[PDB]
């Protein structure tokens, strides 16, 4: 009755991928919620595997290189993430749930994931492409670049740096699909189209509906459910009305319900191997904003592990006459 | 031109069905709005039939029995509600509009309604099943149980209590349909499926669309429009973004528009006999929250009585030349 | 690659069409945003043509006539708007973008537009019909009447006034289509139906979906894309959740996404000649409300000029090896 009976939980408090302080509190925002209690109530055994400790260099140790900010913190953090994720993945099936942390963590989680499962596919749920190459990034923020280091067809656009040697590109462009895009930089658009990356923007969601979008995205990168799935979910893919506490909010996003449909369908493939939830920042917005964002996150992560909005059956059906209590029906004799 | 030319309005300020103070102000929240003025402007004669006075026992008079809180207040209130509702229903057709009050009132309104119209059907619009049997309720809150006392197929799960004798089960499981469910307890799911109660969750709304959901719900319990309809609308069926002032908000609800489509279609059957609106609590949230919730409620109740978003025709068409005023067209001679 | 490579921007700070102070700050709310910067980044040359200065008579100069408030301010303002708009339109094609200002400005913008392009059609995006004739207006507010002075079939319902002589009716009822209606006065409904004006209410959007609604609206008034389009967009057509800072908010409106689809499809006809955005009032609501409303407006206006949510291609593709930088791919030799 359960597709996944156990799962692992991992925190990654990255905050050097972007300038707003507070994404490091992401994992704690979910640990303080009722997420663990709710997942236990659906009968899933969830093991907390702790937090990964990011490498945060002093400013003097990590100057800008090719416009990138904190790039040495990034390379070192990426290798440390990959090792731990690889270990957990090599250690039905047991999904790994990861809570960020800004989205720069994805270079490491996927690198590590791909080590254990080289044939995986990636579903990237995001308002943004996160695939700027360093010389094209207007900001230099690493959370806007994590896919460009992973995609093989892009490596003539990545500047060589010796500390990036261990970050080997493990994805073909044919293995990635986007859902929810609405704020692409022109150079991301060029690369996505040039190398044929499957992508479904909010325009596509409006015109096709999310059911057909989810279907087409799975067909494009996992046509027969043969591949492990890495689901990389930026909370800002969701409309700011339901996920306001995030650093780069873009209006006109996914409703919570559309976000749940994505997670529900991906969960039910049986192939969900890693889900990561990025860009929660509880230091942004009002207290009510933070509670809305926390709530949307918890509902999203529960859907990934298999929670069904149509309800769950009890493990043991309770009966009145078994407790030696007279029912109304019984009394009417 | 009017399906219903008159209607009755009844307040039921129940607040012992759940622990948060303030549902007793529900009827006043609607009486203070412009609802009466707006319904008059569409040409409907609305008669205010006052409030029912709930029986609220002192704590010492009403101890917990089988985990239920305030169960004697509930049985006594239920019988008092049923008598008044039966009277009003026996007294086209004239819909009764009821404003709660927490949802525990429904055991009484339906009991009373069914006395006058034993063949009725129930459309239950709610995030929740409200059909916990007493021994399965985690909370003991009566607003989470009103249907379990009414449904015939469940009576071997209701503990006998002498003061509950006059609460006779008047519904078959085949007469109830749910729309909007997204937070079912496992034992409700068991009972709903075991006894074949028609139900459409937010998953079904996402996959089928609300038009097909409404259609299938009416087909399931009122296939040829032969039966009177009791529409029991929990305001928390609506998304918290539009109805925040309610005690058990659940994210990912019905949009206001989907809520209006339900009410518009039910109204246009000609069979709307009672509509009740439960769980308004103006003591929850900010002032703006309360105004949003009040507004959503007023729009919902107007749709039930037949308000059309596509507009209404005037009772008397006004003409300029009849007031002896020269028009631009006339002057151009 | 660009349907429109240049455009004009015009402010019209009307505020005598309705009693709430603050619509005069509408144009500044958009000038302070990043709208100009964003439109430049998509490669469009946008020329700011300044503001039109409304005629705001002293109260003693402009008494009520036929219940109308500030009607002489209105007639004088309308003629001044029309002259400037006619001039700009006579001066691919170059869309005029107009930011209000309350919606009473539309009598002048369309009058002026029609002078330059007498065969145009009008797409009116609004919660309201804005077509009350003076003797039927409950309020006397001119922003609720701008279409009644323009529509030829209505001129026996317009009271003659000598200062209104230069406001000649330039629209046939067959040239106008509404989208988003949900708060029609009974006499507007009568006139819209009597004279066969195409209209799509929120009921129609719910039942048909916005894609079919947009399609049917264009078919009704511009079946072969032969006519110039005047797009008159009241910000209150959008749901109050995304455009709260406006004077007559009505719940259950267009989502931002549905609003974008309207603008995207109208833009892509190639026939968008004027778009006006009315009823922004930054003196209403909280600071956050104002920022939400500003944001929704900016996204709407960018879609009108051709912004694509699916992304834009760079004007010059950047290449790493052209900057004399060794790529990772290159280094791996
Ligand atoms: N595309 C921008 C924004 C990325 C935002 C990531 N959440 C960049 O590369 O920096
Ligand atoms: N299912 C829960 C919540 C009910 C909430 C009713 N509005 C219960 O039985 O108490
Ligand atoms: N229909 C009303 C409201 C118009 C509101 C315009 N934004 C009137 O004529 O005054
Ligand atoms: Mn993002
Ligand atoms: Mn991202
Ligand atoms: Mn409920
Ligand atoms: Mn309820
Ligand atoms: Mn309007
Ligand atoms: Mn308007």
UniProtKB/TrEMBL annotation, chains A, B, C:
Co-factor: note: Binds 2 manganese ions per subunit.
GO terms for biological process, alphabetical: arginine metabolic process; urea cycle
Pathway listed: Nitrogen metabolism; urea cycle; L-ornithine and urea from L-arginine: step 1/1
Gene3D superfamilies, per database record: Ureohydrolase domain (3.40.800.10)
PROSITE patterns named in the record: ARGINASE_1, ARGINASE_2
Catalytic activity annotation: L-arginine + H2O = urea + L-ornithine
Protein name per Swiss-Prot or TrEMBL: Arginase
Organism: Schistosoma mansoni
């Amino acid at each position: 009755k359960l597709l996944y009976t156990s799962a692992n939980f991992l925190g990654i408090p990255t905050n050097r991928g972007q300038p707003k302080i507070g994404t490091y509190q992401g994992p704690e925002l979910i640990r303080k919620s009722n997420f663990f209690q709710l997942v236990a109530e659906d009968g899933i055994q969830l093991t907390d595997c702790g937090d990964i400790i990011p490498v945060e260099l002093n400013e003097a140790e990590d100057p800008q290189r090719f416009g990138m900010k904190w790039s040495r913190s990034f390379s070192l953090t990426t290798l440390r993430i990959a090792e731990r994720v690889e270990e957990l993945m090599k250690q039905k099936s047991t999904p790994l749930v990861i809570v960020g942390g800004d989205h720069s963590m994805a270079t490491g989680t996927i690198l590590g994931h791909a080590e254990a499962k080289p044939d995986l596919c990636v579903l990237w749920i995001d308002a943004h492409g996160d695939i700027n190459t360093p010389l094209n990034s207007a900001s230099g923020n690493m959370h806007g670049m994590p896919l460009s280091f992973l995609v093989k067809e892009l490596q003539d656009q990545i500047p060589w740096l010796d500390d990036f040697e261990g970050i080997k590109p493990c994805l073909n462009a044919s293995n990635i699909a986007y859902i929810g895009l609405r704020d692409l930089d022109a150079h991301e658009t060029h690369d996505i189209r040039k190398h044929g990356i499957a992508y479904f923007t909010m325009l596509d969601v409006d015109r096709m509906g999310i059911e057909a979008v989810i279907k087409e995205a799975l067909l494009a990168v996992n046509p027969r459910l043969e591949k492990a799935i890495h689901l990389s979910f930026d909370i800002d893919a969701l409309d700011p009305l339901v996920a306001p506490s995030t650093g780069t909010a873009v209006p006109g996003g996914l409703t919570l319900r559309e976000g749940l449909r994505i997670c529900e369908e991906v969960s039910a493939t049986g192939k969900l191997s890693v889900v990561e939830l990025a860009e929660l920042n509880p230091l942004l917005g009002s207290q009510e904003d933070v509670l809305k964002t926390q709530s949307s996150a918890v509902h999203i992560l529960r859907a990934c592990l298999g929670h069904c909005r149509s309800g769950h059956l009890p493990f043991k059906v309770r009966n009145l006459t078994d407790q030696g209590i007279m029912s109304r029906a019984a009394h009417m004799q």
